[PDB]
């Protein structure tokens, strides 16, 4: 019955309605039921038949549309497409004119940006890069870092050589002696 159709699973709801209507009419004929009940059952069958045919053509339209769509995509971004999105993105960020957006962008321009932004752990983990003593002073507020509108508690601080660094020890007189930039490992105060 549904052996020639493309998808018997897709065709099933409309086919059952038609088959059930066809079966009622066949039982009505065999049981020689009233001409009135026969006229009702014939109409129900005509309705279900035309619904089955309507859904069958809709299915053919959707399959053809997808077949054509797949045939045209198969053709397949640009440094240009990425460049167009970069232009849009930075243009919109400036147009927003929000101090926290301006802060994050100015920090990145001066090398204050994340090395890593690791989620989950029920507490987001940020490794921030601080290229000098002045910029480090702006972001670090004691045992906390103020970045991306949030406050992060300091876990660890490292040299550009990966060596452990004590923040108390990073001072004006020491700046020449420290291998910059510093990596501040911190966790979101959540």
């Amino acid at each position: 019955p549904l052996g020639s159709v493309a998808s018997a699973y897709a065709a099933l709801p409309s086919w059952i309605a038609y088959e059930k209507a066809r079966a009622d009419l066949e039982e009505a004929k065999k049981n020689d039921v009233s001409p009135q009940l026969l006229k009702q059952l014939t109409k129900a069958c005509n309705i279900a038949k035309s619904e089955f045919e309507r859904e069958a053509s809709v299915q053919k339209k959707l399959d053809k549309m997808a077949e054509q769509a797949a045939a045209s995509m198969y053709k397949e971004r640009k440094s240009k497409i990425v460049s167009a999105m970069h232009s849009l993105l930075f243009g919109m960020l400036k147009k927003l004119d929000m101090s926290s957006v301006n802060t994050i962008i100015e920090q990145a321009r001066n090398g204050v940006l994340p090395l890593s932004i690791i989620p989950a752990a029920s507490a987001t983990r940020l490794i921030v890069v601080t290229p000098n003593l002045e910029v480090l002073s702006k972001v670090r507020q004691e045992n906390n870092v103020h970045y991306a509108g949030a406050i992060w508690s300091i876990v660890e601080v490292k040299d550009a050589n990966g060596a452990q660094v004590h923040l108390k020890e990073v001072t004006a007189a020491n700046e020449l002696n420290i291998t910059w930039p510093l990596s501040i490992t911190c966790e979101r105060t959540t």
Binding site: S87, G91, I104, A108, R109, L115, S116, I117, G149
Partner: peptide, 30 residues
């Protein structure tokens, strides 16, 4: 949004990022 921008910022070389900001943010043609 600040969390997404930060994640985006992390996926860039510090040097190229500074050029990208200068070109598209500091000197936008919008």
């Amino acid at each position: 949004l600040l969390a997404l921008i930060a994640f985006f910022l992390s996926k860039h070389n510090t040097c190229d990022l500074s050029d990208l900001i200068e070109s598209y943010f500091e000197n936008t043609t919008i």
